[PDB]
Each structure stands twice: as structure tokens, then as C-alpha cells.
Design a protein around this ligand. Sequence first.
Ligand SMILES: N[C@@H](Cc1ccc(O)cc1)C(=O)O
Ligand SMILES: N[C@@H](Cc1ccc(O)cc1)C(=O)O
Lengths: 373, 365
Amino acid sequence: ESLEMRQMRKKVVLIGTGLIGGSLALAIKKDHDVTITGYDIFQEQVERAKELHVVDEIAVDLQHACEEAHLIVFASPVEETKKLLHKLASFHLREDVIVTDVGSTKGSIMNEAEALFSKEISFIGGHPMAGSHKTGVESAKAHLFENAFYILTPMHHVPNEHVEELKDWLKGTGSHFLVLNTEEHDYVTGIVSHFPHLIAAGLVKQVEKHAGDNPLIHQLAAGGFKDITRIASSSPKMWSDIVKQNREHLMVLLKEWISEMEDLYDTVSSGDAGEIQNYFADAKEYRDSLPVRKRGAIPAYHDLYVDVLDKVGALAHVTSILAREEISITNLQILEAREGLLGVLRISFQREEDRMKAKLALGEEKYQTYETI
Amino acid sequence: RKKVVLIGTGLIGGSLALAIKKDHDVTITGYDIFQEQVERAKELHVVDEIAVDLQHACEEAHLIVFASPVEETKKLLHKLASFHLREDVIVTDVGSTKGSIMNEAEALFSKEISFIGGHPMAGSHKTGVESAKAHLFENAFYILTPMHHVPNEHVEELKDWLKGTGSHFLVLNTEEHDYVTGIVSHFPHLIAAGLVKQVEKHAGDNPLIHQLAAGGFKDITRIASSSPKMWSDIVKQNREHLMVLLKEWISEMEDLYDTVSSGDAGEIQNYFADAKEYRDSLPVRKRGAIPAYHDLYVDVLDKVGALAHVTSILAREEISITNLQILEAREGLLGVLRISFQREEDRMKAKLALGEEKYQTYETI
Ligand SMILES: N[C@@H](Cc1ccc(O)cc1)C(=O)O
Ligand SMILES: N[C@@H](Cc1ccc(O)cc1)C(=O)O
């Protein structure tokens, strides 16, 4: 009754069948013929996942499904993930299995996995930099992580071939994979993600302190301030765990920050407009530079600068030209470079051939283009 | 026709001139430091005449509007105080701080002349008069700070002059204005720049910091792209308010350092919840002290022509885009393409047009 090919295809287990996990399942299915068996704490999400062909089967027996699996994917909250990794370490898994997770911090998970498997099993921590942690499987899409950074943190022993193999499993995501060591990941994300969270909340809180003394503050904090502070509305539970899990990195950062504010306090209070202006100019120069896609980093960036006018259809025209030439654009931005209605449009391409081609096509249409600034 | 003088014919000033003209039949004579901006303003019917003689134009004027940098404004106010102006004149400025300008005006005029400091809380991606528009300040707060003696009738008169802006006018005292804007606008600009600077410090030690720069970090620091010149003046002019704020902030960070280092997840959670609760309570889709981004996030697939399709749709609806980006670091942000608009009406319109073409879109809550 069942087809020999269906019986015999590879098998995946997904633990946590929500937005993130469901999306990963769709990206897997897109490029691999597999039986995905799914598991959730909430039985409605797995059943819906099944209905939506996000998973193939609902897991009766967790152990049976795991022991026959070529790939096991955790998309659960990090407490639950620890508890289930323990269970997994009790099981008799296949020799060739790959196990992976999703989480914003890596230190504690990886510390647990070295402690339970050592060198038996190929556990590779993961962090896809896209989407949301609580939202449903109805929203899951194969392209959710497309062109997003997806960090992989392999155990110390895992061969490079297994890391490449996992990249192949997730090929369908279209993510830019970076392989980092665990400390590297928590350090970087600490500076670049977690610490801003703290500062965002702080800003909001500072403003609320004063809002009782004039109600106008609540009115004037609409629009820009509210937009700036967006991340402060994220889950307090999730973020308190992140902060607890990356505590030491953040303590150090806060100490440097206090120090920076003390120097800023000296600059502001000295009242030297030249020094103040310098402080702002340094920040502007750097902030204007982002993305600063470096030469030997992943992925490569080949930029072209175009003189375009601030009018309806300017971008439509430029992008239609490029599309007609069958050139794919990796990024674009408007940089406001001087006065007047002109702006500079920066277009990024995947490789040098494509930039060259775009330069010619735009030139034949009487666009002025540049290589720098 | 009544006669208006505009001193500073750029985005802000030019826009004010257009809003005046919209509801009043007047001769607007313009003046600038840069002769090109005033000549362009004339070409564009933003001003009617280019001022030959500054004093002549000021002495016949019913309304005088300064839209210049606050240093130049002090210098020109001094000149004005030397002139023989009309009995009924109204004089007003545009400036992000009020303390120093008002202080100077009480010192030069005292109770003779009706000076009313002004602050329109709106801005733009551009700087020149070519970008000026009558509706620039529509539904924006526009603060008025009248001298101590100015009768309420003259404040109402000025509101009538500027009816065309569509702004919501608030009459504040000068200290109140600098205190509030200090908390709500200036101080965040300082913190934004500080964050950028903190991050750059570390970027030499790992280049991944440049690459992996998160969405949240980018968002809170977007304002760090504003004019360093303008902001350094603002900071110098509101120095004492900011020194106090920075001191409180240092203290807050020290308490946060205790909370984080104590490791109590309940207390940490409370800190975040307090911030969320408050932030969630702030008005939805209104204008405040920091110009908004008016961003729209769009779900698109990476294939040739994806951007072309989206921008064509928007252009056909005659919506002008201020910016756009493909986000590679977008945790918590559904939708890969971020489009920025000039104002809320345009974002709304773009959302409908894209929706009708079966694009999924998102907006931040
Ligand atoms: N407004 C243009 C894009 C643009 C924006 C700002 C500029 O400075 C230049 C061009 C469009 O809709 O296509
Ligand atoms: N490559 C698309 C734009 C795009 C880029 C990255 C994406 O993830 C999605 C869409 C174009 O050339 O129009």
C-alpha cells in the first residue's frame, strides 16, 4: 500500500512546530524528499502543521522518531531544548545523524551538549537571524530566512563535512550561513543585539520617569521615538532569559557604557561645539557606512553608485533596466549625498560580472554612475 | 497685499512660505545667506521677491519669519532691533531650542515688539527649497513660545498666519519647551550616537560586528545619520538640561548593572515589562518630536525583478519612496524588503496597493 520510495526516503524530526520550525521544515522539503515527523508542546500546532503539509506525520513516540532520523531540528524555547537534549542523549540514534537547534544565545546550549555527547554525536548549534519565537505555523514560509544570516556553532569535534551536510539540508532557506565558535557568537550578538535591547528599554524608562510631571511628554514621544524604541516591546520573558544567559558579556559592556557616558558627560558639559560635533560626525560617518560588507566576509558585495533624482518612478526605472538585463540585485540604498533633488543610489550585486553589466546598461540609458563614495 | 519677510529660504522656511500663501494673499520677500537658494525659491514661486535691502523689507512687513541657524538668527535679531518696524508686526523664528533665542529677544526688545519663538516639529529626508511643501508640518506639533508681555491676541494672530500648515499649535513657556524636547528628542540623539560609537570601538577586534549588526541596533541608531552641525548646536544650547539627564542616565545604568549582575530573572523581566507596557501605551501613528520613519516591510522572494515589480506598483500610485533596503538581519521582523515613505498617507497607500497585488506586508507595533 505504501510506495517503496516513500518508505525509504530520509527522515527528519522537528521539535517545535511553529513559525520558525515550520518554516525550516518547508525549506527542507523544498530541496529534499523526506518524511518530516513533527512534535510540539501544543497539540493544535502540530495538527495544523500536518493539515498544511508542513509536517508529514505527528509523532506518536518521540524516541522512535528520533532513533530512525537522519536529521533532528529543535525549534523550541531553550529551557525545553535542554530538557529534550537530555532525553535524546538517552536514545540510540543513527551513526550519521545531524542534530541542530535554534536559539538567540548559544553558550548554555553548547555547554550542555558537550557535557551530554562529547564526541559521539554531531550537534551543531544554530541561530537563524529572522522571524519570531511565539508566532504560529499558519505564517510559516520556506523563504522566511532568505538572505538572512544563519549562524552555525558546531561542537569542537564535528568534522567540516557534517557542517557542509547541514548546510545542504537547509539549502532551501537561501540563508547566508556563517560558522562561528560559541564564545564568538555570544560576544558579537551581545554587542550588536542584546546590549541595544537593554539601552532601548532604558530609554523608554527614562522617558516614563518624567511623563508624570508633564503629560505632553507622552504626546511628544509618538512617531520617531516610538519607532526607535521598537525592540522594547519584545517579550520580556524571552529577553530576560537572553540577558541571564549572556550575563557576563553584558556586565562588561555596561561598565564600558557607563564609562562612555561619563566621557560624554564631560564633552557635553565642557560645551565645546567642535568636540560635540566630532562626536556626532564620528557616529554619522559609521552609521552611514552600514552595510560595510567586507572583502573576505560572507557574502561578497560589489557596489555601484547611481545618480538619481528624487521623483516618482526613479527606482522603478533603474530596477526595470536591471531586471530586463536579467541582473539580480542583492541590496540597494538611498544615501543623501549632497543638497538638491539628487540622491545617490547604491546598488549591490552578487559578483563583479553583474556589476559591470549593470554599469553598462545604466550608462547606455544616460545614467551617471560611480564606483566610490 | 500684506507683506511677509522670510529669512532663511530652505526646506523649513520655504515650506512655511507655501503654507502662508495657501491661505493668505501676500507678498513674500525672501532672504538667505546663500544667493542660489533665494533665487531658486523665487523661480519656484516660494517667494515673490528677492530682498534687495533687508531693512526696507523688514520695516514694511506685517510678518517676519526667521528660518535660519540659531547663530545667524541672533546676529540678524540684533540688526532687526536697530530697525523702525511697524506697530502691529509679528516676528517669529524656527529653532529646535528656544532658551537662548528668547533670552536674546527679551534683552533686545523687552516689551516693545511681539516676538514669538516657534518650533515646528517636522522634518524631511532633504534640506533644500526644492523639497519645500505646504503640508510639511501637517498634524505636526508646532510650539509657540511668546515673550512674557505678548498679548494672547497676537499669539492667535500668528496662528491665523500659519493656518495653512495644518499643524497643532501649543503655547509653551521657554523652559518647559527646552526641558521636554531635551527629554524626548535631544537626549535620544545623544544615546543613539553613543551606541554607534560603542559598537565601532569593538568593530576592529571582530569584523563580524560590522556584518552581523542587528536590526534593533540599526533602528535605535538611525537618527545618528542627522546633521552633526545641527545637533552639536542643539546640545550646546540645551547643555544644562542634558547634563542633568546624563547624570540621571548614568545612575539608571548603574541600577541596571546591579539588576543584571544580581541575575534575578523576575527583576530583569520587570524592567523590560515596565518599558514595554509604557512604550505600548504611546500614541498610534501620530507625529511627535522626532520625525518618524514611516516604514513598511514587504514579503518578497529573491528573484530577478522583485524590486522592479514592487517599485513599479508604487510609482503607478504616484508614491515617492524615501528609502529602501533588503534586510539580512531581521529577527522579530517579518518581511525582507523595508520601504520608507515621506508621510503616513503615503505608507498607507502603498500598503493598499501592494496588498491588492497579493503582497504580504507588515508594520511595526
Ligand atoms: N523618490 C524616488 C527615490 C529617491 C529618493 C530620494 C532621493 O534622494 C533620490 C531618489 C522614487 O520614488 O523612486
Ligand atoms: N534580487 C531581487 C530583490 C531581492 C533581494 C533579496 C531578497 O531576499 C529578496 C528580493 C531583485 O533583483 O529585484
